[PDB]
């Protein structure tokens, strides 16, 4: 609490917090420089893909068939956008979380992906890229179903991300 000196405070921070935002931004912008536009520095977090589903818990493009992996080339801008292949008792849809340059490998409880898609090039490289029913007898009860995917590349973390490469949902069609 002063007087006729506050101008010595306001003006201070103006160009001190100024200098500091200026440095903070200074260091974000250098960091940002040292990253690919096309690919993150660490894939490791995403390392095994998770499996997620639809139920809340094409003009141009190329025609394809079930087959082996298709290599678009390198992950570079020198070629234009890499071309992408075309694609009661509820229905649930499952997909595999997209991961750049990842090639999945493949070459009784109660009553109740094509390689040609990979590797995924990434959004910058491929914008309108497209990634690839429980008619069951029972009803009016909670059924626990786990859908999962297999592969050498795929791993599950039972203790952790129950999502990692698998689903766990409890459908109940009460009629």
């Amino acid at each position: 609490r002063t007087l006729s000196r506050w101008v010595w405070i306001s003006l201070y921070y103006v160009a001190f917090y100024v200098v500091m935002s200026g440095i903070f931004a200074l260091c974000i912008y250098v960091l940002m420089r040292t990253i690919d536009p096309y690919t993150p520095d660490y894939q490791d977090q995403l390392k095994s893909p998770g499996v997620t589903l639809r139920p809340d818990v094409q003009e141009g493009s190329i025609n394809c068939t079930s087959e082996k992996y298709f290599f678009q080339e390198s992950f570079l801008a020198p070629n234009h956008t890499k071309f992408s292949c075309k694609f009661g008792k509820p229905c649930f849809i499952i997909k595999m979380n997209r991961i750049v340059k990842f090639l999945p490998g493949n070459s009784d409880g109660p009553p109740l992906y094509s390689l040609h898609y990979f590797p995924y090039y990434g959004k910058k490289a491929q914008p309108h890229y497209s990634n690839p029913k429980l008619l069951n007898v029972p009803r009016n009860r909670d059924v626990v179903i786990v859908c999962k995917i297999l592969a050498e590349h795929v791993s599950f973390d039972n203790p952790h991300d129950p999502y990692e490469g698998k689903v766990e949902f409890k459908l109940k069609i009460q009629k």
Partner: protein
């Protein structure tokens, strides 16, 4: 003050008492009176229970405040558990730690913290002292303790020690005649808690048990608001500032959250959320360990401290009112000066005998020494040789012991002399004769003739002499010398010293045969026309360190006031000796004396120094006392009663000063009890003083007082640094949650992560600050104004929160963005995501790239962020540590380097973080994930900027001491 019966006649007293002067009470009557009045005993406070002792601490200031937090954190848990069940430990466990901190914190303190001789039915008998009742006749003799307050009816050569009342040890006479209006002053009353030094006396019991003057001092001095410690008062100012901000922001984040679209459910949770950030959970523990750590050093110093708070109390006082005896002094005295060879000499009075030798050479000196040793009855108790002479106990009266100690020291063994010149006969000092003489066979073998030696009242010795041994030879006692003696006698007498005359005679052999019989009964030999040898006086010396200790306090800007029961001549002499009274300083009386003008004539303002007698003090109003206090720099209150010592202190406190009373005796109790801090002497100190005091000088080393004050200085500062260091990290901890709410981004840091910082990483560094040194000469500065300069002030908060912590937050946020960005989540995409991110159902979350992440997968990334954020703080904490090391000085100047403990803190702190990151099991147990090497670097530019920013700022402060940066920023 008390009102009494000393005025009454003895007969009148008995009449009041229904007692007999000669016979005493009857057994029947004594018993009856007992039931009526009750026992001659003090009524206690109860002992104090163990449970209560712990419980009182539980409030401990911050402790209560912490309860409000824990309870309020429960406010969160209760609302949450009810309406929006969030199954988490977060608020519950958060609330818990805060309270337990007190239980665990409170531990730091718990882990570290007779008979009398009466006359009844004309016969005297010994009885249990409790049996004594008012009215009975009691007899006391030298060596005994006065059993109760007594009215002296009769006494013979009785002297008493009233240090318990006055703090002054020199013996006081007791006679039946009332000396003064003041009961504490009069000769006719002998007080309980006092001991008859010598003589014999009989008196009537006026007061018993609790009723005695001292038997009440405790209750009156005990049940007195012993005030608190300047440190305790200061450790509350900081908390209020902290709370002030915690609440301001906590609520401000209620309102802001509300405008944004959060309900009473959400806006509320945040407010309470906003706590762990404003309240330093670690701070109480740190201050305590700091205090505890300092106390340990003092112990190494031979200075024991009973209370943690006591470590500091040494700096925020303006004036000190000190008791003399046992406080300033050790409690003792001795001879002082001799007059012979028509010259005044001064002996060394000190215990250590730190002074110098006055004179070996004179032939006269030996003749004198001869009489001092020979015409003397006193003997050293047996088995003494281990102990030094002035220390050893002697059997005999004080004056004779003084002579014995003097000769033994300078002369060698007295016994040797006593043996060499055997005592044939002597006339013991008579009351009438006022002198004592002896006749001895001379050691000199040619002669072994008879020598006569005597001593006594100086005037009397002179009446008795024809000649004077000047140098080796005798001379006629011309009127010229008759006066030189008279002058010396008057001067030494002025010194307040007791004076004795000495003379001897080489008896004429013809009249006295080798066998020759002497008659002590009737003067068989000459008593007159003897050779006068010299004069010997008395004197007392104080401790060794005391004068210096006083000097140190004065440089400290502390006022030292002597407050003594003793007589003014003696008090003033010591005052000068210790430095309480400086050279050239003057009292009005000294000016008037030099000027040879009346006192009325002297302008009081001219006198800086003052010496006020208790008798005069009694008449004065407290306002008058206040003025005396305001008016003088060097004050001596002498002949003060215990109540008076209290008044002075109160007078001093009225001024606003923080006062330390230092004292040894029962008479200092009310004062010690009143002082902001009472210091008592360990060895000499009476039990009463000891109970009354806050601190005990086990050593009786007064110098410790200076250390005590010093102890309250370095740590006080170093504590602020540790508060600043700890508080700064609060900001980087808070901001993530807020931004989380405001930005709608995934939570950057978690509750568990915070605890590792506060409980783990910050601890060693925070503690390590105690090791810091002085930036400047701390002794040079004045004591802190406890009201004005708080331990935690707004300039600390602004620095910790506004500036430094802010830089720290960004460093943390940066690592956050880097981890996610690397992962495929660019910062732009991050806004508004939390609902999807947190949504457990979505296994699908699409990143910036287009990849899809499951619930667990993205979570692992976030947890990694929590981990890196945690790490960022440690990296930034390194800078905060280095900068926090000094308030003013450059790291270059201070050398951030010297503090080994601090450096240990950086290494161990980092080791801990790496451990939390790397060790397996840590991902489940504490949700900490491993970090890529690159992650370690993110905060680095932020850490460096902090160091530079602060370093630059302090350079500014130094250049311009007067103005702005210091005013705002300087702790």
């Amino acid at each position: 003050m008390e009102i009494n019966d000393h005025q009454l006649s003895v007969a009148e007293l008995e009449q009041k008492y229904q007692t007999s002067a000669t016979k005493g009470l009857s057994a029947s009557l004594a018993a009856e009176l007992l039931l009526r009045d009750g026992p001659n005993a003090l009524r206690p406070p109860r002992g104090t229970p163990e449970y209560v002792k712990f419980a009182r601490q539980l409030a401990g200031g911050l402790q209560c405040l912490m309860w409000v937090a824990a309870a309020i954190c429960l406010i969160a848990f209760a609302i949450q558990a009810s309406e929006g069940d969030l199954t988490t430990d977060d608020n519950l466990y958060l609330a818990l730690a805060l309270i337990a901190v007190v239980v665990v914190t409170g531990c730091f303190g718990y882990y570290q913290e007779q008979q009398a001789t009466v006359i009844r039915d004309g016969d005297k008998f010994q009885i249990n002292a409790d049996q004594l009742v008012v009215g009975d006749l009691v007899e006391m003799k030298g060596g005994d303790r006065v059993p109760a307050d007594i009215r002296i009816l009769q006494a013979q050569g009785r002297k008493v020690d009233n240090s318990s009342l006055t703090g002054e040890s020199e013996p006081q006479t007791r006679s039946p005649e009332c000396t003064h209006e003041s009961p504490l002053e009069t000769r006719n009353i002998a007080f309980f808690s006092t001991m008859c030094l010598e003589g014999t006396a009989q008196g009537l019991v006026v007061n018993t048990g609790d009723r005695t003057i001292i038997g009440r001092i405790a209750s009156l001095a005990s049940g007195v608001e012993n005030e608190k410690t300047p440190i305790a008062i200061e450790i509350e100012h900081f908390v209020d500032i902290i709370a002030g901000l915690a609440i301001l922001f906590g609520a401000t984040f209620f309102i802001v959250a509300m405008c944004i679209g959060y309900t009473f459910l959400r806006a509320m949770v945040f407010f309470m959320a906003i706590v762990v950030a404003y309240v330093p959970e670690g701070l109480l523990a740190t201050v305590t360990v700091c205090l505890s750590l300092t106390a340990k050093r003092l112990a190494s110093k031979n200075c024991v401290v009973k209370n943690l708070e006591a470590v500091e109390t040494l700096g925020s006082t303006s004036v000190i009112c000190s008791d003399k005896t046992g406080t300033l002094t050790q409690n003792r005295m001795t001879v002082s000066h001799l007059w012979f060879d028509n010259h005044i000499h001064s002996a060394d009075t000190t215990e250590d005998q730190s002074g110098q030798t006055f004179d070996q050479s004179s032939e006269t000196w030996r003749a004198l020494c001869r009489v001092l040793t020979l015409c003397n009855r006193a003997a050293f108790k047996s088995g003494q040789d281990a102990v030094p002479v002035p220390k050893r106990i002697v059997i005999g009266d004080a004056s004779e012991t003084a002579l014995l100690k003097f000769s033994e020291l300078t002369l060698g063994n007295a016994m040797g002399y006593r043996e060499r010149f055997p005592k044939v006969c002597e006339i013991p000092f008579n009351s009438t004769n006022k002198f004592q003489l002896s006749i001895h066979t001379l050691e000199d073998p040619r002669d072994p003739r008879h020598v006569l030696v005597m001593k006594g009242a100086p005037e009397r010795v002179l009446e008795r002499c024809s000649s004077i041994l000047i140098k080796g030879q005798e001379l006629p006692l011309d009127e010229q010398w008759r006066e030189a003696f008279q002058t010396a006698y008057l001067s030494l007498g002025g010194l307040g010293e007791r004076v004795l005359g000495f003379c001897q005679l080489y008896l004429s052999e013809k009249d006295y045969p080798p066998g020759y019989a002497f008659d002590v009964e009737a003067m068989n030999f000459p008593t007159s026309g003897l050779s006068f040898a010299g004069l010997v006086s008395m004197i007392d010396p104080p401790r060794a360190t005391v004068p210096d200790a006083v000097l140190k306090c004065r440089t400290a800007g502390i006022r030292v006031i002597m407050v003594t029961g003793d007589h003014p001549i003696t008090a003033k002499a010591i005052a000068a000796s210790v430095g309480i009274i400086s050279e050239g300083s003057e009292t009005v009386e000294d000016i008037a004396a030099r000027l040879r003008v009346p006192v009325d004539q002297v302008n009081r303002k001219d006198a800086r120094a003052c010496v006020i007698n208790g008798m005069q003090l009694k008449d004065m109003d407290p306002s008058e006392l206040v003025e005396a206090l305001r008016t003088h720099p060097e004050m001596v209150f002498a002949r003060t009663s215990p109540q008076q010592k209290l008044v002075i202190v109160e007078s001093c406190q009225r001024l606003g000063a923080i006062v330390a009373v230092t004292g040894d005796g029962v008479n200092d109790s009310p004062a010690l009890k009143k002082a902001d801090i009472g210091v008592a002497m360990g060895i000499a100190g009476s039990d009463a003083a000891k109970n009354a005091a806050d601190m005990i000088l086990l050593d009786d080393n007064f110098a410790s007082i200076v250390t005590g004050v010093e102890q309250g200085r370095l740590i006080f500062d170093n504590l602020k640094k540790s508060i600043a260091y700890t508080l700064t990290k609060n900001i980087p901890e808070l901001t993530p949650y807020l931004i989380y709410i405001t930005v709608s981004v995934p939570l950057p840091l978690g509750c568990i992560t915070i605890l590792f910082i506060e409980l783990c990483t910050d601890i060693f560094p925070s503690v390590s600050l105690a090791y810091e040194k002085a930036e400047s000469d701390i002794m040079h500065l004045r004591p802190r104004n406890p009201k004005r300069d708080r331990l935690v002030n707004e300039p600390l908060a602004a620095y910790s929160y506004f500036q430094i912590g802010a830089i720290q937050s960004f460093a943390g946020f940066t690592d956050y963005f880097t981890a996610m960005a690397q992962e495929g989540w660019f910062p732009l995409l991050c806004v508004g995501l939390r609902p999807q991110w947190e949504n457990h159902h979505l296994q699908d979350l699409q990143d910036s790239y287009g990849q899809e992440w499951t619930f667990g997968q993205r979570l692992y990334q976030q947890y990694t962020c929590y981990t890196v954020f945690f790490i960022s703080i440690e990296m930034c904490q390194i800078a905060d540590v280095l900068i926090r090391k000094t308030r003013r000085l450059s790291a270059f100047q201070q050398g951030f380097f010297r503090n080994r403990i601090l450096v240990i803190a950086i290494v161990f702190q980092v080791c801990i973080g790496c451990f939390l990151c790397y060790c397996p099991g840590m991902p489940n147990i504490f949700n900490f994930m491993p970090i890529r090497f690159q992650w370690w670097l993110v905060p680095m530019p932020f850490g460096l900027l902090i160091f530079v920013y602060d370093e630059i700022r302090k350079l500014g402060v130094r250049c311009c001491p007067g103005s702005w940066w210091d005013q705002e920023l300087y702790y």
